[PDB]
Amino acid sequence: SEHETRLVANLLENYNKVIRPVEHHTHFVDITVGLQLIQLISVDEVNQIVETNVRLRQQWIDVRLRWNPADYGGIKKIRLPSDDVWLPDLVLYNNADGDFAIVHMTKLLL
Amino acid sequence: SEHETRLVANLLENYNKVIRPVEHHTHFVDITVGLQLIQLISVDEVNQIVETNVRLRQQWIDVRLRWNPADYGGIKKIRLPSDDVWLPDLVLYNNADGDFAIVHMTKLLL
Amino acid sequence: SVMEDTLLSVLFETYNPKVRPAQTVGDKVTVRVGLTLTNLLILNEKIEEMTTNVFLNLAWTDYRLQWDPAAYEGIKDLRIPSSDVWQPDIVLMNNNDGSFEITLHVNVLVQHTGAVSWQPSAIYRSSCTIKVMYFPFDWQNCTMVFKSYTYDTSEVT
Amino acid sequence: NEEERLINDLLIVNKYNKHVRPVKHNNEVVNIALSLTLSNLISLKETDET
Amino acid sequence: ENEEGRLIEKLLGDYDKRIIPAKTLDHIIDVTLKLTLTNLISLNEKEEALTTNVWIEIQWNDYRLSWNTSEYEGIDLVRIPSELLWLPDVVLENNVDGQFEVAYYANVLVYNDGSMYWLPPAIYRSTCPIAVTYFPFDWQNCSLVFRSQTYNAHEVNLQLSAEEGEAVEWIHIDPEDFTENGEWTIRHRPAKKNYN
Amino acid sequence: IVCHTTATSPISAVTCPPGENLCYRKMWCDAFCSSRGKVVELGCAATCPSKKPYEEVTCCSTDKCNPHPKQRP
Ligand SMILES: *[C@@H]1O[C@H](CO)[C@@H](O)[C@H](O)[C@H]1NC(C)=O
C-alpha cells in the first residue's frame, strides 16, 4: 500500500538499529521473554546435549517506531523485517554445539 | 590496467542484470551448454543418488557488453564476475538432495 | 592512523579489484604459489579423500599499490583486507567436495613496491586415488593441485 | 538519546575506518589481551581426533 | 534495447518488498499454493524425518506490478528474481532441521494483471513420527505442513489451487517421470486446509 | 499422408515416409499440468501407439487429423 510504504519509509529514515530504544541512556527497555517448546528432538546422554525446536517470543517497545493511524490510512500493525530494527542479543548461555543467539531473521510485528 | 578499469566501468554503468541479453524481447538467447564430468563421487543405491563433479560450460552473447578494442588499448577479453552480469537459470531437474542451480560464481570470460 | 587512512584513500580511489593488474595490455601477472602444511588430518580411504590444514603462500605484484613512504610517515607495508585488492582465483582443483576457494580470508600484505603477499588458510579436502594392493602396508601419493580457476597463461604466470 | 549523537561523532563525523589499526603512528603495537572461559567440554572423539 | 528493462525498472522503482501488496485495509492476499512431489528420498525411522524434493507453486497478486501491454510492445509476462519482490513467507513448519524456506529462489513470473507464479523447488526434511507396531510391515502417515511464519489470516488467505474450477486437494505426481523410492510406496496423497 | 508432428521446432505439417499413415496425438499432464496444460505429442505412426491410464490418444487415417488443440485441421 502507498500508506504502508510511506510509513515504513518515514519510520526508518533516521532510525539507527544500533542504539537502544530509550528516551534517555539511563533508562532500560523491558523485553518480555517467552519460550514456546514445539518438539524435543534428541537427548544425547553421552555428550549431555538436549536438542529442542523452540520459538523465542520477545516483546518490547521502540519509542522511535510510533505513528498515528489517522495519518497513515488507519494502519495499526505492520510486519517489518528484524534486521531493520534494534533487537536484543538474547543468548543461550548453556549452549553446547549449536547457535548461541537467534539466526533466523524472521519478520516482526510492530 | 587502466584501459580495463575504464572498460569495466563503462560496461556495467547502465547495465541491468535482471534483463535478458536481447536487442528485442521477441528474440531468444541461445546458450550453448556443455558438461565436463571430472569424477564420479558416489552412487547411493539405497536413496538412488549419484554425486558427480562437473563443470557446466555455458556460452552466450550479451550485446550490452560489447566494446571496440581500439578504444581500450587492444583488450579483447576480460574476466568479469558472474554476479555482475545476467546469468541463465539453468537447473538440474532430477536433483535429489543437492543444489538445483549453480552456486559457484567463478568469474566468467567476456 | 591518519596517514594510513590517507594512503588507503589515495590507493583505492580508482582501484578496481575485478581487474587484473597489467600496466601494459598484454602483460602477465606473476603469481608464486607455495604451500605450508599445518596438519595432515585424515586420509579416509573409503571415499578417497585427503583432509589438510594448509596455508597457501601467494605473492604477486600490483602496479597500482605503490607509494613513496617518505610521503606517508615511512609506511613501507600495509595490511589490507583481501576483498579490497585483486587476488588470483588460486584454488584447489582436485577437491572431492565443492570447496575450491580458501576458508580464512586473512588480510593481504602490500608493500610500497606493489608486492602483495597473501598467506591464507584452508581446510582442504582433496581427492587422491588409493592403491589397494598392499594395504595396510601401503604408501600413498595424494597430490594437491593448485591453479587459478579463471585466469590462464595469457594472464598469469 | 545522547548515544545517537556520540556514536555519530565517533564513527561517521570523525571518519572512523575499521580497516585501520588503532594507532597514532604506524610503528606502535596494539596490545590485545585475550582470556578463555570454558563453558562446557562437549567431546573428545578419539576416532576423529577432535 | 529489450523493452523488458524499461518495464522492470519502472515497476521496481517505487517498490518496497517489505510491504504487503494490500491495496487497502480489509484486503487479504489470496495466496494459492500447490505441491508437486519430485522424489521421495528417505524416511529415516531413527531420526523420524521424511526427506522430499518438491516443486511448490506459490501464486498471488501484487497490484504494484501491473502494466498495460500497449505501452510495452505487448509484453504480458516478465521474470523478476524473488530476492527483489515481496513474497509470502510460506514455510515448512514441521521441519526437523531449521530449513523453513525453499532451496532455489527461482524467478517470479509476473503477468500484466499482477499475477505472480513462483515455482521454487525445495528439499525438505519433515518430521513424521513412526508407527512401529507392525514394522517392517508398516505404513506411515507423513505430513508436510505449510504456513506463513510472518503473515496472519487477516493479511493472507492460504488456499489450494483451483485448476478447471476444481480444487487441487492432492499432491501432484508425474506418473511418467516419477521414480518410486525403493523402500516406500505412495498410496494416498491428499491435501487439505486446516485451522488451529 | 500429411500429419502434424512435434518432432520439429516449430511444429510442422510434414508428410510421413512410406509405412506410416496414421496421424496420432498423445496427451498427458506432467509436473506442469497447471501452468501449461497437458503435454502434446504428435507425428506419424504405422499403428496407433498404446494407451495408459493417464494418457489421451487419438489416431486417424486422414491428413492432418492431429493439430495442436489450439489449432484446427
Ligand atoms: C494502454 O496504452 C495505450 C497507449 O499505447 C492506450 O491507448 C490504451 O488505452 C491503454 N489501455 C488501458 C487499458 O489503459
XYZ file of C-alpha atoms and ligand atoms in Angstrom:
710
model
C 0.000 0.000 0.000
C 1.061 3.578 -0.587
C 0.270 4.283 3.059
C 2.393 1.454 4.441
C 5.218 2.227 2.018
C 5.260 5.859 3.131
C 5.049 4.808 6.778
C 7.932 2.354 6.607
C 9.963 4.948 4.739
C 9.322 7.586 7.402
C 9.907 5.259 10.358
C 13.319 4.014 9.218
C 14.525 7.315 7.755
C 16.521 8.495 10.783
C 16.375 5.222 12.721
C 19.561 3.532 13.917
C 19.308 -0.175 14.726
C 22.472 0.190 16.819
C 21.026 2.327 19.628
C 18.597 1.033 22.213
C 15.003 2.310 22.096
C 15.142 4.657 25.066
C 14.488 8.350 25.520
C 17.474 8.576 27.875
C 20.538 6.364 28.090
C 19.926 5.765 31.794
C 16.565 4.072 31.333
C 16.128 0.437 30.378
C 13.989 -1.268 27.767
C 11.990 -4.126 29.258
C 11.837 -7.175 26.996
C 9.129 -9.697 27.821
C 10.610 -13.095 27.018
C 8.709 -16.282 26.380
C 9.703 -19.751 25.249
C 7.393 -21.899 23.139
C 8.505 -25.516 23.016
C 7.482 -27.389 19.885
C 9.311 -30.703 19.912
C 12.126 -32.336 21.828
C 14.339 -33.605 19.035
C 17.072 -35.501 20.849
C 18.802 -36.254 24.121
C 22.456 -37.281 23.857
C 23.070 -38.940 27.212
C 26.792 -39.190 26.412
C 27.572 -35.687 25.201
C 24.939 -34.390 27.652
C 23.086 -32.436 24.974
C 19.376 -31.718 24.574
C 18.116 -30.557 21.181
C 14.826 -28.661 21.016
C 12.807 -26.727 18.465
C 11.533 -23.527 20.059
C 10.137 -20.104 19.336
C 11.634 -17.290 21.396
C 8.788 -14.837 21.849
C 10.062 -11.341 22.612
C 8.013 -8.219 23.268
C 9.366 -4.722 23.718
C 8.569 -1.121 22.902
C 10.516 1.026 20.441
C 9.578 4.649 21.085
C 11.062 5.592 17.705
C 8.653 3.321 15.823
C 5.381 5.109 16.534
C 2.810 6.692 14.255
C -0.769 7.914 14.171
C -3.005 5.621 12.083
C -5.137 8.612 11.101
C -2.171 9.915 9.092
C -1.440 6.503 7.548
C -4.823 5.225 6.445
C -5.801 3.558 9.705
C -2.827 1.200 9.823
C -2.231 -0.224 13.282
C 0.156 -3.108 12.551
C 2.989 -3.872 10.163
C 5.456 -6.711 9.636
C 8.869 -5.116 9.419
C 11.973 -7.248 8.916
C 14.044 -7.816 12.017
C 17.414 -6.808 10.576
C 15.919 -3.345 10.046
C 15.293 -2.510 13.716
C 17.083 -2.873 17.020
C 16.886 -6.336 18.545
C 18.068 -7.736 21.872
C 21.017 -10.122 21.933
C 19.418 -12.962 23.852
C 21.972 -15.763 24.085
C 21.695 -19.350 25.281
C 24.388 -19.474 27.942
C 24.187 -23.257 28.328
C 24.549 -23.833 24.596
C 26.509 -26.950 23.704
C 27.233 -27.277 19.986
C 24.596 -25.172 18.213
C 23.867 -21.484 17.830
C 24.001 -19.130 20.791
C 21.726 -16.392 19.504
C 18.895 -16.219 17.001
C 19.929 -16.625 13.375
C 16.515 -16.861 11.662
C 15.828 -13.214 10.838
C 12.078 -13.530 10.730
C 9.846 -10.519 10.355
C 8.404 -8.906 13.456
C 5.076 -7.329 14.318
C 5.002 -3.610 15.078
C 45.157 -1.985 -16.167
C 43.644 1.442 -16.691
C 42.051 0.586 -20.025
C 40.335 -2.429 -18.483
C 39.256 -0.366 -15.479
C 37.596 2.266 -17.652
C 36.054 -0.529 -19.703
C 34.634 -2.406 -16.719
C 33.193 0.891 -15.544
C 31.642 1.708 -18.924
C 30.137 -1.753 -19.448
C 28.378 -2.011 -16.084
C 27.315 1.644 -15.953
C 23.690 1.448 -17.122
C 23.665 -2.349 -17.377
C 20.922 -4.230 -15.533
C 21.465 -7.936 -14.935
C 17.762 -8.663 -14.399
C 17.065 -8.240 -18.122
C 17.766 -10.810 -20.815
C 20.515 -10.026 -23.336
C 18.447 -9.399 -26.460
C 18.125 -6.395 -28.737
C 14.372 -7.056 -28.776
C 12.240 -9.005 -26.324
C 10.995 -11.235 -29.146
C 14.458 -12.602 -29.858
C 15.862 -15.509 -27.879
C 19.091 -16.180 -26.014
C 20.974 -19.152 -27.451
C 23.045 -20.687 -24.663
C 25.451 -23.396 -25.783
C 25.532 -25.710 -22.786
C 28.271 -28.221 -22.156
C 29.028 -30.659 -19.377
C 32.543 -31.680 -18.376
C 32.485 -34.622 -15.986
C 35.516 -34.664 -13.700
C 34.875 -37.528 -11.299
C 32.075 -39.760 -10.108
C 31.976 -39.337 -6.348
C 29.311 -41.798 -5.246
C 26.399 -43.976 -6.284
C 23.965 -44.404 -3.396
C 21.954 -47.464 -4.369
C 19.632 -47.077 -1.376
C 18.493 -43.488 -1.845
C 19.200 -43.684 -5.590
C 21.523 -40.679 -5.726
C 24.587 -40.078 -7.897
C 27.151 -37.438 -6.981
C 29.257 -36.010 -9.787
C 31.863 -33.282 -10.040
C 31.004 -31.400 -13.223
C 31.898 -28.150 -14.921
C 28.782 -26.678 -16.533
C 30.163 -24.798 -19.518
C 27.815 -22.093 -20.769
C 28.247 -19.764 -23.730
C 26.040 -16.913 -24.892
C 26.123 -13.345 -26.169
C 25.303 -10.160 -24.270
C 25.195 -7.344 -26.818
C 25.217 -4.877 -23.926
C 28.767 -5.985 -23.069
C 30.474 -5.308 -26.398
C 33.226 -2.775 -26.978
C 35.776 -1.616 -29.508
C 39.301 -2.766 -28.587
C 40.864 0.203 -30.375
C 39.234 2.406 -27.725
C 40.579 0.341 -24.822
C 44.174 -0.491 -25.737
C 43.675 -3.729 -27.632
C 41.703 -5.534 -24.943
C 39.622 -8.365 -26.358
C 38.981 -10.480 -23.247
C 38.192 -9.795 -19.599
C 37.163 -11.864 -16.580
C 34.105 -10.190 -15.090
C 32.352 -11.764 -12.105
C 29.213 -13.745 -12.744
C 27.094 -11.907 -10.170
C 27.661 -8.687 -12.126
C 26.002 -9.825 -15.374
C 22.920 -11.736 -16.442
C 23.088 -15.482 -15.954
C 20.733 -18.184 -17.234
C 18.743 -20.033 -14.587
C 19.934 -23.482 -15.575
C 18.571 -26.008 -13.106
C 19.056 -29.722 -12.536
C 15.531 -31.106 -12.609
C 16.392 -34.574 -11.311
C 18.205 -33.156 -8.307
C 17.720 -35.287 -5.223
C 19.256 -33.501 -2.250
C 21.921 -31.145 -3.606
C 21.778 -27.739 -5.237
C 19.332 -27.210 -8.079
C 21.308 -24.419 -9.726
C 24.893 -23.241 -9.772
C 26.164 -21.677 -6.552
C 29.816 -21.094 -7.522
C 30.088 -17.876 -9.499
C 33.655 -18.345 -10.698
C 34.287 -15.263 -12.845
C 33.315 -15.667 -16.479
C 35.144 -14.691 -19.657
C 33.857 -11.936 -21.932
C 46.491 6.292 11.962
C 45.771 9.308 9.806
C 48.492 8.613 7.245
C 47.168 5.085 6.769
C 43.663 6.389 6.082
C 45.032 8.993 3.669
C 47.172 6.441 1.850
C 44.316 3.954 1.568
C 42.021 6.669 0.244
C 44.673 7.534 -2.340
C 45.421 3.992 -3.499
C 41.790 2.912 -3.772
C 40.238 5.935 -5.496
C 40.045 4.318 -8.944
C 41.366 0.873 -8.000
C 39.066 -1.935 -9.114
C 39.739 -5.425 -7.704
C 37.870 -7.097 -10.561
C 40.724 -6.039 -12.848
C 43.929 -7.991 -13.245
C 46.985 -5.735 -12.941
C 48.623 -5.364 -16.337
C 50.351 -1.990 -16.547
C 50.516 -2.644 -20.297
C 47.906 -4.551 -22.281
C 49.342 -7.999 -22.926
C 51.413 -8.369 -19.776
C 51.163 -11.381 -17.498
C 50.943 -11.306 -13.721
C 53.473 -13.499 -11.943
C 51.978 -15.453 -9.044
C 54.173 -17.515 -6.739
C 52.296 -20.445 -5.220
C 53.680 -22.081 -2.108
C 52.067 -24.302 0.488
C 52.603 -24.593 4.229
C 51.220 -27.783 5.729
C 49.995 -27.407 9.299
C 48.370 -30.818 9.709
C 47.567 -33.905 7.680
C 44.286 -34.704 9.381
C 42.708 -37.647 7.590
C 43.153 -39.842 4.529
C 39.840 -41.684 4.522
C 40.249 -44.493 2.013
C 36.555 -45.407 1.875
C 35.847 -42.205 -0.092
C 39.353 -41.481 -1.430
C 39.674 -38.159 0.355
C 42.521 -36.284 1.993
C 41.939 -33.555 4.569
C 44.614 -30.986 5.382
C 45.010 -27.669 7.149
C 47.343 -25.617 4.979
C 48.487 -22.064 4.449
C 48.765 -21.037 0.850
C 51.663 -18.642 0.290
C 50.785 -16.405 -2.639
C 52.768 -13.454 -3.907
C 52.223 -11.124 -6.836
C 52.773 -7.547 -7.944
C 50.036 -4.946 -8.419
C 51.481 -1.843 -10.063
C 48.601 0.186 -8.630
C 49.532 -0.364 -4.980
C 52.695 1.723 -4.959
C 53.623 4.769 -2.918
C 56.571 6.685 -1.545
C 56.862 6.034 2.212
C 58.585 9.397 2.680
C 55.206 10.931 1.816
C 53.339 8.764 4.355
C 55.412 8.833 7.557
C 57.576 5.932 6.451
C 54.757 3.437 5.909
C 56.552 0.680 3.998
C 53.911 -2.048 4.331
C 50.139 -2.200 4.701
C 47.771 -4.931 5.829
C 44.660 -4.665 3.677
C 41.541 -6.866 3.641
C 41.771 -9.357 0.812
C 38.391 -8.331 -0.600
C 39.748 -4.866 -1.390
C 42.603 -5.881 -3.700
C 42.695 -8.012 -6.801
C 43.612 -11.573 -5.987
C 44.002 -14.511 -8.360
C 41.478 -17.300 -8.084
C 44.088 -19.782 -6.901
C 42.041 -22.782 -5.827
C 42.275 -26.496 -5.189
C 41.053 -28.113 -8.386
C 41.352 -31.715 -7.203
C 38.910 -31.293 -4.365
C 36.388 -34.001 -3.591
C 33.885 -31.641 -2.015
C 32.893 -28.498 -3.875
C 35.193 -26.176 -1.945
C 37.669 -24.717 -4.405
C 38.457 -21.484 -2.601
C 40.162 -20.968 0.745
C 38.344 -20.713 4.069
C 40.094 -17.950 6.031
C 40.464 -14.648 4.188
C 43.317 -13.142 6.099
C 44.237 -9.657 5.022
C 46.940 -9.284 2.396
C 50.355 -7.723 2.912
C 51.013 -4.891 0.469
C 54.454 -3.329 0.156
C 55.121 0.093 -1.306
C 56.527 -1.623 -4.403
C 53.204 -3.234 -5.242
C 54.290 -6.598 -3.863
C 51.224 -8.335 -2.454
C 51.730 -11.309 -0.157
C 48.728 -13.355 0.920
C 49.128 -16.292 3.308
C 45.558 -17.564 3.654
C 44.464 -20.742 5.377
C 42.232 -23.595 4.322
C 40.859 -26.910 5.479
C 41.091 -28.592 2.086
C 39.538 -31.942 1.182
C 41.439 -33.267 -1.818
C 40.790 -36.363 -3.901
C 43.550 -38.934 -4.214
C 43.402 -42.429 -5.654
C 44.112 -45.152 -3.123
C 46.205 -48.089 -4.317
C 44.593 -51.114 -2.653
C 47.205 -53.773 -3.212
C 49.424 -53.678 -0.116
C 47.006 -52.071 2.323
C 47.655 -51.575 5.223
C 51.334 -51.764 4.258
C 50.772 -49.117 1.619
C 52.251 -45.791 0.582
C 50.050 -43.126 -0.977
C 50.914 -40.277 -3.400
C 47.921 -37.980 -2.749
C 48.689 -34.728 -4.586
C 47.144 -31.277 -4.208
C 46.629 -29.404 -7.476
C 46.583 -25.613 -7.471
C 45.878 -23.124 -10.226
C 43.766 -20.102 -10.988
C 40.245 -21.197 -11.817
C 39.634 -18.488 -14.403
C 42.982 -16.844 -15.220
C 45.225 -18.668 -17.687
C 48.777 -18.466 -19.014
C 47.956 -15.445 -21.171
C 47.040 -13.650 -17.948
C 49.053 -15.045 -15.029
C 52.350 -16.904 -14.854
C 19.274 9.980 23.122
C 22.910 11.080 23.844
C 24.236 7.747 22.396
C 22.804 8.628 18.918
C 24.910 11.866 18.853
C 28.053 10.184 20.268
C 28.042 7.113 18.027
C 27.789 9.554 15.138
C 30.567 11.859 16.325
C 32.820 8.792 16.642
C 32.154 6.662 13.559
C 30.809 8.995 10.855
C 31.929 12.536 11.683
C 35.464 11.526 12.631
C 35.599 9.213 9.598
C 36.490 6.157 11.643
C 37.958 3.410 9.464
C 37.506 -0.125 10.768
C 40.242 -1.482 8.481
C 42.952 0.537 10.226
C 44.661 -0.340 13.479
C 44.049 1.992 16.434
C 47.482 3.596 16.438
C 48.515 7.214 16.015
C 51.714 6.196 14.212
C 52.156 3.013 12.209
C 55.024 1.948 14.446
C 53.148 1.322 17.702
C 51.629 -2.045 18.573
C 48.048 -2.801 19.521
C 48.170 -4.990 22.606
C 45.274 -7.453 22.572
C 44.661 -9.216 25.859
C 42.642 -12.394 25.394
C 41.476 -14.859 28.018
C 39.412 -18.004 27.577
C 36.409 -19.254 29.517
C 35.384 -22.881 29.093
C 31.611 -23.101 29.201
C 31.497 -26.827 28.524
C 33.620 -29.609 27.073
C 31.407 -31.430 24.605
C 33.538 -34.227 23.194
C 36.964 -35.673 22.557
C 36.131 -38.127 19.786
C 39.232 -40.287 19.626
C 38.475 -41.641 16.158
C 38.199 -38.193 14.579
C 40.883 -36.878 16.970
C 38.927 -33.708 17.668
C 17.088 -2.370 -26.304
C 14.950 -5.046 -24.520
C 11.583 -3.356 -23.654
C 11.606 -5.539 -20.512
C 14.167 -3.229 -18.925
C 12.087 -0.105 -19.301
C 9.267 -2.101 -17.753
C 11.114 -3.752 -14.875
C 12.909 -0.543 -13.917
C 9.549 1.228 -13.950
C 7.911 -1.390 -11.732
C 10.713 -1.912 -9.217
C 11.164 1.838 -8.985
C 8.821 2.861 -6.179
C 8.578 -0.742 -4.992
C 9.190 -1.874 -1.420
C 9.457 -5.632 -0.939
C 8.872 -5.336 2.807
C 5.331 -4.136 2.140
C 2.413 -6.492 1.694
C 0.648 -5.510 -1.550
C -2.681 -4.960 0.165
C -4.412 -2.350 -1.969
C -6.301 -1.158 1.104
C -7.277 -2.164 4.570
C -9.779 -5.036 4.593
C -7.796 -6.704 1.776
C -6.493 -10.232 2.297
C -3.862 -11.516 -0.123
C -5.227 -14.777 -1.506
C -2.110 -16.947 -1.587
C -2.620 -20.102 -3.631
C -0.048 -22.863 -3.275
C 0.226 -26.274 -4.882
C 2.722 -29.064 -4.289
C 4.439 -31.340 -6.781
C 6.397 -34.273 -5.411
C 9.502 -34.968 -7.472
C 11.285 -37.588 -5.363
C 10.756 -39.322 -2.045
C 14.323 -39.563 -0.847
C 14.178 -41.166 2.592
C 12.221 -41.811 5.756
C 14.828 -42.189 8.489
C 12.981 -44.183 11.126
C 15.639 -43.283 13.694
C 15.534 -39.520 13.152
C 11.826 -39.845 12.261
C 12.297 -37.475 9.334
C 10.889 -37.591 5.815
C 13.069 -36.149 3.060
C 11.361 -34.866 -0.077
C 12.210 -32.921 -3.202
C 9.137 -30.872 -4.061
C 8.265 -28.125 -6.507
C 5.791 -25.945 -4.631
C 3.911 -23.468 -6.804
C 3.004 -20.258 -4.996
C 0.541 -17.920 -6.686
C -0.617 -14.470 -5.608
C -1.381 -10.977 -6.874
C 0.673 -7.805 -6.436
C -1.269 -4.766 -7.636
C 2.020 -2.851 -7.822
C 3.424 -4.979 -10.663
C 0.636 -4.380 -13.163
C 1.056 -2.655 -16.502
C -0.607 -2.049 -19.844
C 0.910 -4.095 -22.644
C 0.315 -1.432 -25.284
C 2.851 0.802 -23.535
C 5.425 -2.020 -23.596
C 5.133 -3.542 -27.076
C 2.791 -6.294 -25.937
C 4.871 -7.685 -23.077
C 2.456 -9.577 -20.834
C 4.963 -11.666 -18.878
C 8.147 -10.720 -17.050
C 10.547 -12.720 -14.899
C 11.783 -10.935 -11.789
C 14.109 -12.533 -9.224
C 12.356 -13.306 -5.968
C 15.062 -11.508 -3.988
C 13.610 -8.266 -5.398
C 9.933 -8.878 -4.668
C 7.558 -9.294 -1.790
C 6.869 -12.946 -1.117
C 4.593 -14.625 1.404
C 6.831 -16.343 3.920
C 5.376 -19.753 3.146
C 7.479 -22.260 5.055
C 7.552 -25.839 6.245
C 6.782 -25.761 9.951
C 7.047 -29.483 10.644
C 10.761 -29.489 9.846
C 13.367 -31.255 11.955
C 16.255 -29.084 10.803
C 15.923 -25.321 10.594
C 15.260 -25.137 6.859
C 11.890 -23.433 6.795
C 12.459 -21.872 3.389
C 12.931 -23.168 -0.155
C 16.233 -24.275 -1.673
C 16.333 -22.463 -5.022
C 14.929 -18.945 -5.030
C 13.711 -19.057 -8.594
C 12.412 -16.103 -10.535
C 8.803 -14.998 -10.226
C 6.784 -14.873 -13.420
C 4.925 -11.564 -13.305
C 1.893 -11.025 -15.525
C 0.364 -7.742 -16.621
C -2.537 -8.116 -14.182
C -0.208 -8.515 -11.214
C -0.447 -12.293 -11.143
C 2.666 -13.973 -9.795
C 3.703 -17.561 -10.477
C 6.584 -18.734 -8.305
C 7.679 -22.347 -8.789
C 10.565 -22.742 -6.372
C 11.967 -26.218 -5.808
C 12.652 -27.319 -2.279
C 14.343 -30.065 -0.315
C 12.523 -30.563 2.961
C 13.413 -32.767 5.931
C 9.982 -33.058 7.512
C 9.068 -34.713 10.795
C 6.686 -37.635 10.808
C 6.543 -39.977 13.812
C 6.782 -43.653 13.047
C 4.240 -46.344 13.879
C 6.479 -49.262 14.782
C 3.693 -51.635 15.833
C 3.722 -53.567 12.542
C 7.268 -52.727 11.485
C 8.544 -53.727 8.934
C 5.055 -54.337 7.521
C 4.143 -50.757 8.330
C 2.538 -47.836 6.545
C 3.371 -44.306 7.625
C 1.235 -41.173 7.518
C 3.756 -38.387 6.996
C 2.615 -34.775 6.707
C 4.024 -31.597 5.192
C 2.609 -28.555 6.962
C 2.875 -25.268 5.083
C 2.025 -21.951 6.670
C 3.278 -18.387 6.680
C 5.536 -17.702 9.646
C 5.167 -13.955 9.093
C 1.633 -13.091 7.993
C -1.697 -13.971 9.557
C -5.152 -14.726 8.188
C -6.258 -11.091 8.332
C -3.343 -10.476 5.944
C -3.032 -13.547 3.706
C -5.537 -16.299 2.984
C -3.719 -19.537 2.265
C -5.709 -21.729 -0.085
C -5.205 -24.533 -2.559
C -5.036 -24.230 -6.319
C -8.181 -24.285 -8.438
C -7.474 -25.946 -11.786
C -10.538 -26.047 -14.050
C -12.591 -24.674 -11.165
C -11.916 -27.787 -9.077
C -9.622 -27.612 -6.071
C -6.321 -29.482 -6.257
C -6.675 -31.328 -2.963
C -3.733 -33.639 -3.586
C -0.005 -33.740 -4.132
C 0.720 -33.785 -7.843
C 2.932 -36.615 -9.072
C 4.080 -37.052 -12.664
C 3.056 -40.660 -13.400
C 5.702 -40.956 -16.133
C 8.710 -39.032 -14.764
C 8.301 -40.117 -11.130
C 10.705 -42.737 -9.794
C 9.321 -44.803 -6.938
C 11.652 -44.682 -3.968
C 12.772 -48.253 -3.382
C 11.521 -48.881 0.141
C 8.346 -46.779 0.326
C 5.296 -46.849 -1.934
C 2.865 -43.935 -2.087
C -0.793 -44.909 -1.752
C -2.560 -41.678 -0.777
C -1.501 -38.076 -1.215
C -4.250 -35.716 -0.021
C -4.096 -32.039 0.834
C -6.466 -30.025 2.987
C -6.676 -26.596 4.534
C -6.617 -26.906 8.310
C -7.214 -24.386 11.074
C -5.993 -24.445 14.662
C -0.276 -38.552 -45.745
C 0.053 -35.123 -44.105
C 0.456 -35.326 -40.325
C 1.269 -32.755 -37.670
C 4.465 -33.664 -35.818
C 6.131 -32.370 -32.667
C 9.446 -33.813 -33.879
C 10.232 -30.347 -35.241
C 10.684 -26.898 -33.716
C 8.361 -25.169 -34.520
C 5.618 -27.705 -35.159
C 5.339 -28.586 -38.833
C 2.933 -30.336 -41.180
C 5.239 -32.902 -42.782
C 4.321 -35.968 -44.791
C 5.093 -39.390 -43.397
C 7.551 -41.751 -45.136
C 6.187 -44.996 -46.608
C 4.763 -47.322 -43.967
C 3.117 -44.825 -41.589
C -0.182 -43.156 -42.494
C -1.817 -42.821 -39.064
C -1.626 -39.322 -37.559
C -1.614 -39.740 -33.774
C -1.816 -37.337 -30.843
C -0.781 -38.277 -27.315
C -1.595 -36.052 -24.361
C -0.941 -36.179 -20.636
C -0.221 -33.581 -18.000
C 3.118 -33.708 -16.173
C 4.506 -31.718 -13.233
C 3.438 -28.603 -15.173
C -0.170 -29.816 -15.505
C -1.418 -26.386 -14.397
C 0.672 -23.504 -15.760
C 0.942 -25.060 -19.219
C -1.539 -27.900 -19.630
C -1.300 -31.401 -20.972
C 1.726 -32.425 -22.962
C 1.263 -32.613 -26.722
C 2.997 -35.293 -28.778
C 2.190 -35.507 -32.483
C 3.573 -37.176 -35.568
C 3.441 -40.321 -37.677
C 2.706 -43.936 -36.830
C 2.063 -47.198 -38.646
C -0.205 -48.300 -35.782
C -1.826 -46.292 -33.016
C 0.560 -46.454 -30.021
C -0.689 -47.944 -26.789
C -2.629 -46.038 -24.143
C -2.051 -45.818 -20.406
C -4.473 -44.700 -17.679
C -3.231 -41.093 -17.695
C -2.798 -40.626 -21.452
C -5.300 -39.360 -24.025
C -4.621 -40.650 -27.538
C -6.405 -40.100 -30.845
C -5.187 -41.716 -34.072
C -6.642 -41.125 -37.529
C -6.295 -42.215 -41.149
C -6.687 -38.816 -42.853
C -4.414 -35.834 -43.470
C -3.686 -33.515 -40.536
C -6.070 -35.081 -38.019
C -3.723 -34.270 -35.115
C -3.335 -30.498 -34.781
C -2.405 -28.808 -31.558
C -5.611 -28.383 -29.513
C -5.195 -24.630 -30.056
C -5.433 -25.072 -33.836
C -7.669 -26.758 -36.400
C -7.034 -29.438 -39.064
C -2.766 1.083 -22.996
O -1.934 2.068 -23.586
C -2.407 2.561 -24.845
C -1.351 3.511 -25.354
O -0.324 2.816 -26.046
C -3.769 3.221 -24.657
O -4.266 3.658 -25.917
C -4.737 2.232 -24.024
O -5.972 2.877 -23.734
C -4.148 1.667 -22.737
N -5.032 0.662 -22.168
C -5.591 0.775 -20.959
C -6.471 -0.360 -20.539
O -5.399 1.750 -20.242
